[PDB]
Design a binder for this molecule. Structure first.
Ligand SMILES: Nc1ncnc2c1ncn2[C@@H]1O[C@H](COP(=O)(O)OP(=O)(O)OP(=O)(O)O)[C@@H](O)[C@H]1O
Ligand SMILES: Nc1ncnc2c1ncn2[C@@H]1O[C@H](COP(=O)(O)OP(=O)(O)OP(=O)(O)O)[C@@H](O)[C@H]1O
Ligand SMILES: Nc1nc2c(ncn2[C@@H]2O[C@H](COP(=O)(O)O)[C@@H](O)[C@H]2O)c(=O)[nH]1
Ligand SMILES: Nc1nc2c(ncn2[C@@H]2O[C@H](COP(=O)(O)O)[C@@H](O)[C@H]2O)c(=O)[nH]1
Lengths: 448, 445, 56, 101
C-alpha cells in the first residue's frame, strides 16, 4: 500500500517549518490525517524512556508527593509504563517504597515474609493490611531461610476470634504441606503450583530450609498484565527522583541497593555545573543505572547534559512561565535524537490530544502529573465535601489509574490511526522525513 | 443526668409553632443544641421503614433506573438500609433483579448453581463473570439436586489454556471432597467449613445428591457486615416498585414469588381511587407484603391511604415545601402507628438529619447516591472527569458514602443531645427539642 | 485613588532584589551588565510566545 | 566553564530578530535559560542611572506626588537605589524635601 500511503502532493506544513517562528502551544496546531489500512488495535504506542529501557506504554508518572508512591509506581509498571517515586521524604522512606515496587511481582520470591510459631494471629492480620500479602511462612526462629514448620493463609485465621492465639494453633503444618526441592526451574515450579490448586509453593533444600517461595498471584499478574514493565529478574521496573546536591549522593546508593532501574534528576533547570558533575559521578560510580537528566528546554542545555552522559532528558517546566512546550519538545527532542538520546515530555499536558501531539513532535514518552492525580493509586486520603469525592489542594476522584491508562492508551491508538501509521516510532520518523504534516491554526480557527 | 438534659427555660421554638405558618424548606430553620453525655458512636439512628421493618440504617435507595438495580439493593441491605428495585423494566427483568438480592446472602444455599461434567470451562468463567458466584457444583445432568461428582473453583481453572475442555479434567472429584449429611444445623455446618479451610461445603442426602450448600463467603459477610438487613431466612431484605394499574397486578405476583419483603407504590400523587383499590387488593391477596403508599404531601391524602391499609408513606414531590410536608404528614401518620419515608429535597446530610428529626423515620436517597459504583450504567471519561451514563460524577463506592452519612447523623444527633433518633422524634413532639427559624439574611452567612 | 498597604518599601525592595538575582541566575550570567552585553552579542536568546501559549 | 556557558547551537531567537517586527509587550516573549555555576546570592544587579552614577540596586522611585517625597527618597538610597522627588509643589517645598534627604 506504499503507493497510497506515501505523499507526493504533500499538502501541509512540515514540522521544521511549523516551529521555525513563534513559540507554539499544542493548541496552535493540528496534525493532518494520512492513510488508513489497519485497525487501531494494532497500533504500537511504545517509546524509549531511556537508551536501554523501552516502555510498551509511553507513560511515566510524575515524581510528585501527590502522585507517585509505591502504589502508583506498581500500577504504571503493570500497565507497561513506569513510575518515578518522588524524593520528598527521607532516604529510608524512599528506598522502602522502591523495595515495595520491585518485590511486588516476582518469579521466585527470595526473602519470603516469615514469622515464628510464637507470633500471634493478630500480627499476620496486620501484615495483610500493611504489606498486602499472605502465605506467610512459619519457620524456625522466624528466619526467612529457617526450617519450615508451616504456612498461614486467609482461610486459616479469618474465623479465629482470639487474635492472641499463636500461629502454630491454626497454621497448616509442614507434614501436610506440598512443597518442592531446590533446584527447580521456574517453568516447572509454577506448573506444580498450578496443578496443586494451592496459592503458594515453598521450595526447600535438603534440610527442609526455605530457599524461596512461589506465589500463585505472580502467575495471574503475568496473565492479567502481559505487558508489564519488567527487568531481567521478572521484577517490575521502578524509577526514583533525586536532587543533585552532594548530600543526595547518599540517597542514590540507598536507591541503588533498593534496586531502582532509573534515576530521574529533579531540577527546574538542569543545565547546572552541579547536575553535570552529578551525572558524571553516577555513571562512574553506578554504571548499571540509567539517568534521566533535566529539566531542559533548549538544545544548548541539552548538549551539556548529553555530554555528561545522560541516557534521557526531561523537557519542560515541570518564575515561571517558560518556553512553549510544543516548541521545546520539538527542538530539543530533534537535537537529542541525533545524539541517540530519547526525551520525556514533562509539562503542559492537559489531555490526550496534547499527549499525542507531544509524542508525535519528538518525545518518546510523556510524564503524567495532573492528568492522573486523584486516582485510587495516588497518595492521599479520600473525603467528601458538597457531595463530591475529593483527594488530599484538592482534586476529584478519577477511579483507578488502571482504567485511566487504558483510556489514554486507546486514545493514542485512535489518534495514530488517524495520522495513518502503525506506530509512534514511525510517526516520529516521518515527521522528520516530512511525510507527516501539520497545520498551524489561527486564533479564531481555535475558537470552534 | 436528667436534671441537666431536660429543659425548663425552653429557649427556642417548638416544631408545632415553627410549622404553623408558611411552608418551610429545610434551610429555613435549624435545630438548637441540647446536652451531651455520650460519645457519638453510641447513637442509634434506626428508623421504621414499614410497620414491621426496622432499618438499622434509616436509608432507602430510590426506585429510579439511575440508582437502584440489583447491585445497589445489595449494598444498601448490607449496610443496614434497604433498596427499592425500580420498575422501568419488564416484569421478568424486575423479578430477576430481586432474586439477585435475596439469593446473594444465604445461610444454606438451596438450588445451588450446578453444571454437567460435559460443560466446558468457558461456561464456569462466564458464571463467574456474570452472576459473580464460584464454587459451582458438578452433578448428574447439571441438576441442582443431582448426584454430586465434583466442584469447580477459581484455582481449578485459572491456569487452563484450553477453555473448551470439560470441567471433569480440572474439577475436584467427589471422592476428595469434604461434605456433610442432611440434616445438620447451620451453625454446625459453618463450623465444619471453617475447620476445613475450604470456601464451600455441600450438604448431601443418603444417595450423595445435593440438598443444599454452604459458602465461606456468607460467613465473612456476616462478620464484615454485622448490621445487614435480613429476613427470617438470613437473606438480604429487598423492596421493589410498582404502579397501581390493573396491568401491574401481574407484576406484584411475580415480585412476591421472587421474594420481595416490601412493595413500594410509584405515584406522583397517591391519593387516587386506583391506589386505594390497589392497596386493598395487595392486602387481601398478599398479606405477607408490607406496602408503601404515596406519594403524599397532606394529612388528608395520608388518611385515605392509611385507611386503605398502607404500612408506610412516601412524603414528597414545584410542590408543597418538604420540611412542612414531612412534619404535617408524619405527625398525623404517627398517631395511627404508620411511619413515613422522606422522599425529596435531600441535598446533603444536613437535610437528611432535619427530615428525620421532624418526623420521617427513614429517608429515601436518590441524587445523593447517584453516580456511585453500585448504580446502574457504565463509567466514561470527559474533560479529565470520570462520569456515569444526563450525567453525574463518580462518587466512589456507596458503601463508603453510606458510612459517611451514618457518622454524619450520629454527629448531628449528638449535638441535639439525644442518643437515638426515636428519642429526637419523640422529644420534638414533646417540645423538649427546639428549633429556630432563620431570616433570609441569616441564611446568607 | 486608593491602594492597599504593602508594608515598608524596604521589605519590598529586597524582594525585588532577590527576584532579579534568581532570574539572572536562570539566564546564567552573574550580572545584568553581562546579560545586556550578551543580549547584543546574541548569546542570550529569547522566544516569542503565541497568544495561546500565553494563556497557560 | 566558558566551554559549558557559551552557546554554539544557539537554539533561540536573538533580540535584534525578536524586535524586528510587531511592537511587543513584555508578555509577548520569554528569556531562554542558560548555564548555572553559581549561587543567586552572588548576582550583580547594578546599573547606570546616569553616565557617572551607578546604582547598586537598579531601582528608581517614580517622581509622583503619590510615591516619592523625602521619606521614600531616603529609603531608596539606603537600599542602593535612588528617589526622584516629585515637582508638584512649590520650589521651597521641593527643596525642603531635598535637604531632608
Ligand atoms: N503449599 C501448600 N501446601 C498445602 N496446603 C497449603 C499450601 N499453601 C496453602 N495451603 C493451605 O490452603 C488453605 C488456603 O488455600 P489457599 O492458599 O489457596 O488460600 P488463598 O486464598 O490463596 O490464601 P491467601 O488469599 O491468603 O493467599 C489454607 O488452609 C492453607 O494452609
Ligand atoms: N468441599 C470441598 N472439599 C474439598 N476441596 C474443595 C472443596 N471446596 C473447594 N475445594 C478445593 O479448593 C480449591 C479452591 O480454593 P478454595 O476452595 O480454598 O476457595 P476459592 O478457590 O478461593 O473459592 P472461589 O472459587 O470462590 O474463589 C480447589 O482445588 C477446590 O477443588
Ligand atoms: N511470604 C511471602 N512473602 C512475600 C510475598 N510477596 C513478597 N514477599 C516478600 O516479603 C518481603 C516484604 O516484607 P518487608 O521486608 O517489607 O517486611 C520481601 O522479602 C518480599 O520478597 C508473598 O506473597 N508471600
Ligand atoms: N454454587 C453456588 N451457588 C450459589 C452461590 N450463591 C448463590 N448461589 C445460587 O446460585 C443460583 C443462581 O440462580 P440463577 O441466577 O442461575 O437463576 C441460585 O440458586 C443461588 O441461590 C454460590 O456461592 N455458589
Amino acid at each position: 500500500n506504499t503507493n497510497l500511503r506515501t505523499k507526493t502532493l504533500r499538502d501541509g506544513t512540515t514540522a521544521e517549518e511549523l516551529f521555525s517562528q513563534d513559540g507554539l502551544s499544542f493548541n496552535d496546531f493540528i496534525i493532518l490525517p494520512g492513510f488508513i489500512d489497519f485497525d487501531s488495535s494494532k497500533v504500537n504506542v511504545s517509546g524509549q524512556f531511556t537508551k536501554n529501557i523501552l516502555l510498551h506504554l509511553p507513560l511515566v508518572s510524575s515524581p510528585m508527593d501527590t502522585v507517585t508512591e509505591s502504589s502508583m509506581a506498581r500500577a504504571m509498571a503493570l500497565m507497561g509504563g513506569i513510575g518515578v517515586i518522588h524524593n520528598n521524604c527521607t532516604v529510608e522512606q524512599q528506598a522502602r517504597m522502591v523495595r515495595s515496587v520491585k518485590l511486588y511481582r516476582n518469579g521466585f520470591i527470595m526473602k519470603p515474609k516469615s514469622v515464628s510459631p510464637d507470633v500471634p494471629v493478630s500480627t499476620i492480620r496486620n501484615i495483610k493490611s500493611e504489606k498486602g500479602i499472605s502465605g506467610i511462612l512459619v519457620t524456625e526462629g522466624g528466619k526467612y531461610d529457617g526450617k519450615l514448620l508451616g504456612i498461614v493463609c486467609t482461610k486459616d485465621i479469618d474465623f479465629v476470634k482470639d487474635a492472641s492465639a499463636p500461629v502454630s494453633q491454626y497454621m497448616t503444618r509442614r507434614e501436610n504441606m506440598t512443597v518442592e526441592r531446590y533446584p527447580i526451574k521456574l517453568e516447572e515450579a509454577m506448573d506444580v503450583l498450578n496443578r496443586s490448586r494451592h496459592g503458594y509453593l515453598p521450595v526447600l533444600n535438603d534440610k527442609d530450609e526455605v530457599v524461596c517461595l512461589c506465589s500463585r498471584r505472580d502467575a495471574v499478574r503475568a496473565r492479567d498484565y502481559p505487558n508489564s514493565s519488567l527487568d531481567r529478574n521478572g521484577h517490575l521496573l521502578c524509577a526514583a527522583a533525586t536532587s543533585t546536591r552532594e548530600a543526595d549522593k547518599g540517597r542514590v546508593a540507598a536507591l541503588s541497593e533498593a534496586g531502582i532501574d532509573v534515576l530521574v534528576l529533579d531540577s527546574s533547570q538542569g543545565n547546572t555545573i552541579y547536575q553535570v558533575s552529578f551525572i558524571r559521578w553516577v555513571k562512574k560510580t553506578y554504571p548499571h543505572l540509567e539517568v534521566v537528566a533535566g529539566n531542559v528546554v533548549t538544545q544548548d542545555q541539552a548538549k551539556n547534559l548529553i555530554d555528561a552522559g545522560a541516557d534521557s532528558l526531561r523537557i519542560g517546566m515541570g518564575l515561571a512561565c517558560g518556553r512553549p512546550q510544543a516548541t521545546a519538545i520539538y527542538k530539543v527532542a530533534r537535537y537529542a535524537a541525533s545524539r541517540g538520546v530519547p526525551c520525556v515530555a514533562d509539562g503542559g499536558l492537559r489531555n490526550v490530544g496534547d499527549v499525542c501531539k507531544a509524542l508525535a513532535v519528538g518525545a518518546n514518552v510523556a510524564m503524567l502529573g495532573s492528568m492522573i492525580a486523584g486516582t485510587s493509586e495516588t497518595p492521599g486520603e479520600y473525603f467528601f465535601k458538597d457531595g463530591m469525592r475529593l483527594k488530599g489542594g484538592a482534586v476529584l476522584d478519577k477511579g483507578s489509574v488502571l482504567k485511566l491508562l487504558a483510556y489514554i492508551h486507546k486514545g493514542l491508538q485512535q489518534s495514530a490511526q488517524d495520522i495513518g501509521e502503525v506506530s509512534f516510532d514511525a510517526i516520529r520518523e516521518k515527521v522528520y522525513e516530512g511525510q507527516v504534516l501539520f497545520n498551524r491554526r489561527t486564533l479564531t480557527a481555535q475558537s470552534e
